[PDB]
Design a protein around this ligand. Structure first.
Ligand SMILES: [Fe+3]
Ligand SMILES: [Fe+3]
Ligand SMILES: [Fe+3]
Ligand SMILES: [Fe+3]
Ligand SMILES: [Hg+2]
Ligand SMILES: [Hg+2]
Ligand SMILES: [Hg+2]
Ligand SMILES: [Hg+2]
Ligand SMILES: [Hg+2]
Ligand SMILES: [Hg+2]
Ligand SMILES: [Hg+2]
Ligand SMILES: [Hg+2]
Ligand SMILES: [Hg+2]
Ligand SMILES: [Hg+2]
Ligand SMILES: [O]
Ligand SMILES: [O]
Lengths: 340, 340
């Protein structure tokens, strides 16, 4: 029941963000929520080309790094690459088919595009600091430790995508597919989308910032400057991305959009909460692998765990969730230098 | 089923363009088909922003235009806008779930993004010439003369998408859904893909170029020059888009990527041929509506039909199809000043 151009003439200002009539005409002279049009404009003004960034000094710095520091740097970079690869395609494949207002549709496609740029920036770095990029990339696929911290992200997207396909193909109701009773509930699909959004928020607002911190710890040492410039540009984009999800989520919560969504947000707020807690624990567990061969002066498991609790509390409060961790001050104030 | 991150470590250099294992790691240090990485690079270097183009004098030009000429200009514009709206979302929703090599996946996302920039530019133009955009945007959805090609185009995409979902959910075989038998064949799915692709090639290589001619005729008379500058940038991007689909199609029919595709394409060559002729015929018929109240300088029914046939022959030959029209030289050499 999905269409690349619905023939019904509809008022796009009255459609909900998700699950309404598929978007027809892409117009930008008006919007239901101008925040998304503002995000598109901002992201477009931030356009940057990875290959332009000079990383010729990074090869020297990297090779000069002690084995354990190279391990920290490379493990962190491989994790960023993993998430970036997923973020480049998922917003488009999982969300795009469910959007019913033009400004949000284009925001998602712009957001997804900026992610491929980030992935390209990572190839640019890897390619210039290692002899064979294939070892780094192949390792990303295997290596349980990396897939361990990312566990749950791709599977959630995949589940939303599958449920969406059933909805579009069969419509709401109880069906019989190859002798099996398959239930298709729009309410259930909405919750899956809602929670997918919460997970993407946790991903970009928490997981990536923890990685930024690890990257900048080297920048603080006057090392890996090329990579540092790239991380600064990426973080600049990420701030827009998480701003977008925080708005989608808080707007759905307000009851000003789809009424059922506000009900859903309230109904499963414990799931939203649990999603962040698990995400936070995963970042902590990752520390054991990251520092397996040793840590660095101002970068270890304790400092990383403290930062996770710090950033998690801030992100959760921004979407109206109770705080799971004790409140504390920024364990690494030096990161402000590299951010904003 | 589809996944946003296949856990199997595979060789992306040996996967076919479509239907192979979903792409995991987005890497750009290597590629099976170099052309896609070059197109991404070129498209990025062509980045531009509609808002930066001065279109301040187009409103006065449009108002002074004779009624029939206003009709010609606005009808043409509405058609282009319709097509960009489709091209912005469709490549992503339709092709992404079927791509199995990284360079092709990112090209499609970059190509799609590029299309949203074009849609944004049309809003920029429309807002600075009618000061009442809604009338223009709503007519796109319902205009009978326009909503004929749109239907066929959206139909190919929609059918491919639907068959793709069935394949991903149920796989090949004979299934039952609520008392009905549902057959899923990979051969038929591959044919549909080959068919969207051929149709998209005609959309960008023929349909849009005819519209470019409709647009630059005004520029030749030093009118609607704001619009003209924007169309030049769009046509510049379009050359890359058609180059992309041409390579996809030639690789698929040559048998170097998938022997079954080469086999399938040879079987439906007559269908493809007719598909191309039909597209050309729709563009021709559009002339009766465009010049129903009179034609203009250097542009009329006969000239347009000549250009359609000239362009169609070139594009079809480029993808290995026979020429349906009598050969001739460019009927409007002056167009080359705005194209290539
Ligand atoms: Fe990113
Ligand atoms: Fe992001
Ligand atoms: Fe376009
Ligand atoms: Fe195009
Ligand atoms: Hg998700
Ligand atoms: Hg860190
Ligand atoms: Hg819920
Ligand atoms: Hg919640
Ligand atoms: Hg802690
Ligand atoms: Hg198509
Ligand atoms: Hg024309
Ligand atoms: Hg064919
Ligand atoms: Hg064809
Ligand atoms: Hg003709
Ligand atoms: O990002
Ligand atoms: O295009």
């Amino acid at each position: 029941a999905y269409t690349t151009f619905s023939q019904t003439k509809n008022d796009q200002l009255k459609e909900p963000m998700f699950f309404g009539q598929p978007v027809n005409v892409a117009r930008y002279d008006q919007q239901k929520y101008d925040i998304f049009e503002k995000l598109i404009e901002k992201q477009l003004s931030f356009f940057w080309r990875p290959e332009e960034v000079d990383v010729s000094r990074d090869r020297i710095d990297y090779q000069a790094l002690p084995e354990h520091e190279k391990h920290i740097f490379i493990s962190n970079l491989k994790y960023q690459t993993l998430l970036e690869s997923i973020q480049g395609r998922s917003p488009n494949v999982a969300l795009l088919p469910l959007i019913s207002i033009p400004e949000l549709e284009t925001w998602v496609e712009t957001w997804a595009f900026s992610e491929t740029i980030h992935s390209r920036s990572y190839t640019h770095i890897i390619r210039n600091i290692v002899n064979d990029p294939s070892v780094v990339f192949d390792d990303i696929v295997t290596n349980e430790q990396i897939q361990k911290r990312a566990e749950g992200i791709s599977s959630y997207y995949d589940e939303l995508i599958e449920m969406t396909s059933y909805w579009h193909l069969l419509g709401e109701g109880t069906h019989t597919v190859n002798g099996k009773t398959v239930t298709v509930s729009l309410r259930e699909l909405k919750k899956k989308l809602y929670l997918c959004l919460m997970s993407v928020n946790a991903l970009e607002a928490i997981r990536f910032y923890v990685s930024f911190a690890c990257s900048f710890a080297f920048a603080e040492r006057e090392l890996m400057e090329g990579n540092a410039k790239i991380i600064r540009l990426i973080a600049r984009d990420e701030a827009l991305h998480l701003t977008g999800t925080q708005h989608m989520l808080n707007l759905l919560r307000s009851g000003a959009d789809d009424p059922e969504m506000a009900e859903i947000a309230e109904e499963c707020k414990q799931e939203c909460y649990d999603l962040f807690v698990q995400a936070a624990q995963q970042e902590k567990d990752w520390a054991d692998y990251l520092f397996r061969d040793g840590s660095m002066i101002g970068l270890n498991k304790d400092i990383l765990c403290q930062y996770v609790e710090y950033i998690t509390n801030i992100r959760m409060q921004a979407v109206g969730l109770d705080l799971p961790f004790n409140t504390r001050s920024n364990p690494i104030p030096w990161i402000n230098t590299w951010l904003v």
